[PDB]
Scaffold this active site. Structure first.
Site, PDB file in Angstrom:
ATOM      1  N   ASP A  38     -56.934  17.867 -31.044  1.00  0.00           N
ATOM      2  CA  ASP A  38     -57.064  16.580 -31.708  1.00  0.00           C
ATOM      3  C   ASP A  38     -56.973  16.931 -33.201  1.00  0.00           C
ATOM      4  OD1 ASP A  38     -59.544  13.864 -31.347  1.00  0.00           O
ATOM      5  OD2 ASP A  38     -57.541  13.933 -32.260  1.00  0.00           O
TER       6      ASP A  38
ATOM      7  N   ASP B  28     -63.334  11.143 -37.800  1.00  0.00           N
ATOM      8  CA  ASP B  28     -64.553  10.350 -37.649  1.00  0.00           C
ATOM      9  C   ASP B  28     -65.614  10.668 -38.694  1.00  0.00           C
ATOM     10  OD1 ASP B  28     -65.523  12.849 -36.899  1.00  0.00           O
ATOM     11  OD2 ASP B  28     -65.846  12.330 -34.814  1.00  0.00           O
TER      12      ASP B  28
END
Length: 207
Positions: A120, A10
């Protein structure tokens, strides 16, 4: 221990990029919109409207056919951020096309998952996810919000620094979709600490 994984990128400032997130010599380096390391660890996150973004060099890469080094946002059962920031973990995949392969990752940020062991993995083009600092950083990355792009060819439009991490996903990783794994914390190989500049005080204790 057992855990499961997801993938993301992100562009946000890593959570372990702030001081006081763990017993380390210094937190994980942040980078400016132009992927250059930032001197100020107090800098505001690009996902907060600030200039601190995630460094492209904090990307996964292959050591050999059975091993890769990398980074990930972590969430460990009943633990807190102070116990995992900059700590390294050897993951051995137990599912997917990569079952049997190993990947030593250093936790550079914190995932929003509770009551579970979740990693993640940082993968350029793996999906912005909840937040999106990539749009502000350079106009954004293609791909679905969660999961990101679906083909290696799609990496061709990414900013140069992010392309190798994006391609690693379809090569060494063989486009594995959220593979599970067994894991143990290990001493951070010097190659990881060399990319993030963050080494825990209790690292030497792990072999």
């Amino acid at each position: 221990a057992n855990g499961q994984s997801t993938r993301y990128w992100d562009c946000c400032k890593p959570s372990c990029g702030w001081r006081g997130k763990g017993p380390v010599n210094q937190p994980v380096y942040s980078c400016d919109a132009n992927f250059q390391r930032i001197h100020d660890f107090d800098a505001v996150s690009g996902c907060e409207g600030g200039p601190a973004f995630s460094c492209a060099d904090h990307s996964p890469w292959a050591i050999n056919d059975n091993l890769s080094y990398g980074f990930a946002a972590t969430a460990l059962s009943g633990q807190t951020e102070e116990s995992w920031c900059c700590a390294c973990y050897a993951l051995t995949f137990t599912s997917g096309p990569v079952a049997g392969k190993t990947m030593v990752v250093q936790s550079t940020s914190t995932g929003g998952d509770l009551g579970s062991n979740h990693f993640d993995l940082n993968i350029p083009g793996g999906g912005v996810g909840l937040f999106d600092g990539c749009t502000p950083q350079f106009g954004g990355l293609p791909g679905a919000r969660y999961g990101g792009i679906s083909s290696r060819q799609e990496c061709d439009s990414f900013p140069e620094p992010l392309k190798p991490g994006c391609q690693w996903r379809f090569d060494w990783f063989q486009n594995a979709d959220n593979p599970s794994f067994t894991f143990e914390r290990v001493q951070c190989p010097e190659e990881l600490v060399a990319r993030t500049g963050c080494r825990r005080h209790d690292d030497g204790g792990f072999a």
